[model samples]
Target: KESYAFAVLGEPRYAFNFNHFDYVNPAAPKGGQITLSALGTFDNFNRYALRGNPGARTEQLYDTLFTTSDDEPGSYYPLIAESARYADDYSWVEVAINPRARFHDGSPITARDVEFTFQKFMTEGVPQFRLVYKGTTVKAIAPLTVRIELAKPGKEDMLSLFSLPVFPEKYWKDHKLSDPLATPPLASGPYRVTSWKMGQNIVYSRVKDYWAANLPVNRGRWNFDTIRYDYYLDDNVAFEAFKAGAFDLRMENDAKNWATRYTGNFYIIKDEQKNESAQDTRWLAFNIQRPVFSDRRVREAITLAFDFEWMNKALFYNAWSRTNSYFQNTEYAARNYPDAAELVLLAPMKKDLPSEVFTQIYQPPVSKGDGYDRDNLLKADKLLNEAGWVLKGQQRVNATTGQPLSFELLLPASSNSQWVLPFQHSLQRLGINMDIRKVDNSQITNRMRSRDYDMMPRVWRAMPWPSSDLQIAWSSEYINSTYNAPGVQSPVIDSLINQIIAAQGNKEKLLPLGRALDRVLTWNYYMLPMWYMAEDRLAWWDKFSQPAVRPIYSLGIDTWWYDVNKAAKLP
Candidate 1:
């Protein structure tokens, strides 16, 4: 191996308290340009280091910021800022810039930039993203420090404020922070866009001139010279490219393809494999606003209707695990139902959802055999009938409202489309009027962002924190039909979340509120539970290694580098 052994890093790390920690030879960190492929792509790629195109994980090479870590909270002590701390009442928050912090272009990252950046997230960040700094004023109190005055005291306000990308004040002074995703994005993070492949990939080259290149907090990362992304519209095409050695690493989803394909291939030189438990989860959602979905009876009915066995074995190629809470299969997600622990956590908010929904925290499978259990479905139908629904011939119609009880579900057309298709067919057979709309890729985001679909087939990346959790999917203000997917517009859930955010390191206090929130949400039937991927998957060329510190994260792709000596030379 070159002068020293190298370390490789590739895994999902939510870029907050966590970090792409362990740079340099503080031990060999994985080094080299890793080429990977995934499901989504970037729509507005120029939105600074913060609001960016979600895909093309490669952009991470150029953008580096504070990492998430409960082990140590706040963005202070890093090269970017001195320290970010909060006031006791949660009424005010402050961050003292590192003074030494600078953009990749060598421009100093001042308190003004930090203040302005926080202000933008306050005003125009994504509904969920902006919700973190709800009711706050970001003001530069001094050249080295900025004060964030809360409209109301909130939990982790300072922590959430620093989580935003620090913008360049002069570059975007009069520009539209409202439309942060517009052209010519500006950020003080590590990487800057050099060129783009158009509808494909964007390339990033390290800024050797970066201010934090050698800072104590940035000790061993940002080691690569160049990072590239190769875009493929279809995951299958992406997979084929990986097998052909078109990329240094590729991700596989089709379990059968992973089990049978990649073998005896005539491609690369060496291949070694290791995998961890799959951390991501998928689910079927019920739109709580709709007439039928608004009823707990119909919502519970649909949950029972899902045939997970058929969806996995017949469709998913046998790769999955059934999930209950919104947390999916990770410890970061709390277990709300069936736990006395969860119930105690939710006891205060009994008014939020149906008592029966949370009465049993951990309800088991209804019965066994044929994958279609009658007990659960029968119970669900009874609940629906009692909710003023009538049996009209074979279809269920609302007795008082005279509206037919039905749902419209959507999914992208792909091999995994089979994942939810069986559920749709199952519901149709149960006298539920259902229509399945398989839209093109273009419509998926459009429908989701606009809340344009009646019942959305949605999946959210598993969030690791309550701040992120409430802001991303559960916030009611962002739930407008034309604005966000969650379609939440209510004072009840909002008040609960507000309370949670208002609580400080009393963070555990918010856990109970979350359980109550889950009860309300589950009763709404906003989502049908899908299973988690059973296998942890990772595939890369054999040229790199990871650091001993190996911090945990979520993106799993596109991060700044440190030990790239193991980098594979393009033969």
Candidate 2:
């Protein structure tokens, strides 16, 4: 897109380029290395994406079907499959699979892989990605075609979960499916990794004569013959490296940096600034194991302690915009909320989905400040006492469990500490001792997976594909299914989650149920909705261009590149 002058912050954001092209673009050039920086490292892709085998770091070098893209969710587009359309009731959908769409290793993406990704993720993936495809079965009618049938189709995004990377059966069949890193993987993307230094960097080069390189999306993109990721634990250290010209792009994460520090590189690079971005929002996921936390009033009460006013000024340097709902910045986020009459569609389900549960879903507004608001803290302290916990010399002891009312607040040691850590000061003043522990990404992933956490600082890594990944985060059943997966049992909450999944097409009915869940999940003290940033932050070299629109997929540092031979360095 440089010829027409388009640019980006990173890889996943490529799909949103107004100069957006279809997959396998014809104008696509054949070579150059595209390198970028990342916060840390990955243990393994761990989960199974849709159709093909996503290779291990040790496996085939790249994923055959699962590279990041903006394909229609719950289905594929023109490359392998043309399109997928749903029959409003959500009972069954037909997939017009492709016979000629070949995998990197020469095998065509068939109907079977489509079936496998669904059944496996449903059985193997986290709840959010699994539940929507629940009670659904896939049937292969022919080598290139299949029919996906849902058991209880309601107002659901049944196909909502299908947009994952596909896996070719042959490449990964004999390999263990548990850890993606342990097996030999195959992918269908433009380049494949050839070498890497663990926790340091990974190098990938364009596949010689890649089959789908001519697809529309590949045009003006993937020009790099090689791609590299240099890992740095500290974001500041990473940013410094970007400034020094170690990587091509730096997608800014700290809004303060995006708003200020980046002006130099942004002005110097000029055109490449379009690629700088931050995820849609930065939010906190509250642990819901405690009772007082389940009450909407209680979650609302704790939220009041956040003090957004002080936060934006002090931390963001008054750069970011605040958020309320889980999907504040996204278009799909419900705008005109329900009025009493409008909420009636959710009334019948509310018979069991109590007001208490409803409260757990809806939270009140909060501002920035210390939790010392006498009224706020007093109310906070008062609620804990009423919830059976009484304060003793600033410490709280639960009446029922007789245990110290304390929870650990874990944050990635790598996160911008200046912003996320102030809560230690804010939350502790109210007698709720939040023990802040800065751990690495590996440890954080392990702990969250094990449900070994009390209350931790977390933001559900979002995907642009609005797939059924919710089950991955909030679903009780999924918590139990994983190590913590099947173990997360909340009948009422579970039923509600299922109801929400089943209620896919019925937005009128679905949103209230969601708001109810939000109230319950929030009020139930299962989680505290934290901050959401306004943009996807990034910084990179002067050679490439980024799209100027909202992304179609997650941000991609790997996909940003140019003709290295013609590329220029960061000033």
Candidate 3:
């Protein structure tokens, strides 16, 4: 019913005639290296691979057709593609590739490359992509035009197409798509993976003649001549390195360190950590597929066993708050029992869920901040008893099989030991041996890829709009996504996700669907509640100057420039 040169979920704040985003300084100088740190080692350069541990900054090597605006949610501006054409029903979308778009080696990018990337991901990329773009057909209509036909109409789907990383048919054709090669693949972005050490570090040097450097979406950014990511295997060692001036900036999350250890020429500033993936909640994710966690009663019983209050006081210096919602600290979070609009969606799935979801507001069990509390311990004991886990000789065993209730909590980092010890003590009271296993970050990545763990810490931020990949995080289809580490698989949850995607650009419908989704996830107890800082927490050495304004949805570190004037004054 309608057509536009570009497609966006909602009204785009930037007009087609607009030159630059408000958050960036158009005249900012571009020089100096920004040294950052990574916690793990990577063996692969392909971030989308299912097997190897991809380098942290590998994805920055490629370019998408459309670049998103951090200032606005669900909106985009052209990058590789000159313009996009789509109809109101979204049956089809045609993109006119920019003639000047080139690969790192100076080869012109074409429509064929776009189609190649889509088909490649469809067959060999992450399994979720195939499910997400199912029934859609893509064709290289011309050297500069690529067309996509959707089997269904959806605003998110259309917008998702813009996010696909365009591949160079020439470069990727010869390499193993899923294997990590020592040689970095061709890049089309502002930087290229120019050098690295297998385990110690990786360096990205800005492409001096990068094709999109002056594009409106890229102007005044990627200023650093070199961006180096030095890898450290342990958080404690990394902190020591940071204090020793090993890295220029650190995003401090450990409250104890932030309060007591950060010293000598370091500066801390508060910004509402605007990364789209900000941690809304950190949690103990249960593998629901496992027999011990199959029942909601068992999951809820374990949830009550976590003494977050005591841990906050004793371990975190009382700097964090217990997370209550999947969409915590966001407007999308469901507070009370289903409202009228939410009830409409919940009504159909009523028989499939707990009755308490309809009657009570979802609240994680309240702990009195003291490490010892018989009230919640008794509550947990009763729930476990009802779920057929009876205490037999100080060990809770399944009444049917006589299997003892014991599981390992595989931790990704060693720094979490302090945080997990108190929770483990609480589990001990219930005759549960929650073994805390600390492993290397690379090993953790490998295990998660194979779904080879009992439980792990999973965190996800609530986005302003649920992305197309939300299903990959919770739906049954993406049983393998590390993002879905909790192993959530529910038809009702999937149905609500569909309702969410279908609502598209309409706040009235989105709010209700989001609330319903949150309520269902919260009630199921898929994740044992942890905690989150509602604001940005960061510490940096005073050596660089940032743009006057930060993007509404990003910290805008990319927009920051190294100040030679300030660096000259450093002792």
Candidate 4:
């Protein structure tokens, strides 16, 4: 059935004839300039390109065929396309473009532009796009109708088509999607880049005559008249500037800073907003492709050496919880024991999986929080010895090759030294030489692309609901892709991912499959699970008013509006 909206998992919350979303105030006045902070410099405007760092929030300049609501998971409402329909078997999708949709130059958006964007992404965009959209065919059947035929049938494959950023075909005819764009391109979104100072700053002005500004899905969003992003190299300096009123608002990530530094400012509103849909999990992922981490025993030993309890108390101010499962803070997270439903998926793989996956509840190594975790270290040493890396005169060396147990931890410049120093000390106690290598952002990116590091701390963004992106992230087929950071290549994991993808629409089947996948991933010791906070640490000057209800999945900052009365009171 064709509809104005589509939900990959469940029924959409809003009807076809609905007004603005419940999370927004349709009468919210829209006018004011807001400034935010961005890390590092940017030179390109094409975010889809592989080369060059794109400016922050470049996505604001383009519109997808459908846009998702923050309140619902996997639900999408009409944006550029007015209506969409897919084949019963999920093999093909067709979208009818809204004829009133126009680019920044006032030219009408057509189906040809949608077809062109898909082709551009397939040919010149990131390699992952090629992997995801291979064998997919696109055609503009009419001026306002576009159809896409998938190589295979999948609910996710059909849903992915809705997010293809529709670029102007006529304008892109002169531009190459593979190259870095120095100048801003013609866009059809709510805001367009108006000015830039290269690396220092970039500014976007709201399109006063944006075609979809009054659309139900967009009613109370993108209220700011102008938005500016100022780039900073150092996070400490950026925090200082934020305190000095250099930026309008900031989402604080450092636990210590949020606990201590946000005070003495009467004008600033410091609050911890609970995020029910929090899906981010920080971890120290091992490069399993490396010989040193090839053995499951060695990886488990390394995982046991890190003491999260001590670090949380002494450094993080006890503001975080230890992350155990890949799907932390979600229903899909593996709990106390595998239920009968999850057993159906896990039982067959038991012979190949760890015995503990069946006998014991999966939990990270716990510590006494006394800074010196002796018992866990002894356990780690025992595991190392069992794995043939026995201690020889203060150094752990492989019995076969005599190669010392040593690996470098690659960290970006912005990473806190405190987070790793304690872990490094713990590894040293186990006779393991863990070198800390701090590099600049560009170097880290390049190293990650080439898989040159032994280990790195990465935050895997939360997947509220499993989708086909999981294939790129964990499937052995895309092991070379940066998304598969740990170089995981397991038949069990690949099979579970396929099952989860196939079970998308049915929550009853999807939930159990997701939990099974989580248990397998966690039990394998692929990543030394770190920590996550359920609340968003936020600080902002009291110059704006927000909607009464916040979206379940996001902060819904776009629904906020500037208040002159509140601004006048601020220093």
Could you say which candidate leads in lDDT?
Answer: 4
Query: What ranges in model 3 sit over 4 Å off?
Result: 1-8, 265-279
Local accuracy of candidate 3 as per-residue lDDT tens digits, 192-280: 88888887888899888988889888888989999999988877888888778788888777888777886653543333353434346
Deviation in angstroms for 260 in model 4? Answer: 1.4
Count of clashes, each model: 51, 111, 0, 1
Local accuracy of candidate 1 as per-residue lDDT tens digits, 133-162: 556677888998777787765545544454
Query: Ten residues in a row with the worst lDDT in model 4?
Result: 412-421
lDDT of each: 0.56, 0.54, 0.80, 0.86
Best-to-worst ranking by TM-score: 4, 3, 1, 2
Give me candidate 2's TM-score against the actual structure: 0.77
- lDDT: the better of candidates 2 and 4: 4
Q: Which stretches of model 4 miss by more than 4 angstroms?
A: none
- Model 2, residue 295: distance off in Å is 6.6
Top-TM-score structure, candidate number: 4
RMSD of 1: 6.5
Q: Report the Cα lDDT for candidate 1.
A: 0.56
Q: Pairs clashing in candidate 4?
A: 279-462
The lDDT, on a scale of 0 to 1, for candidate 3 is 0.80
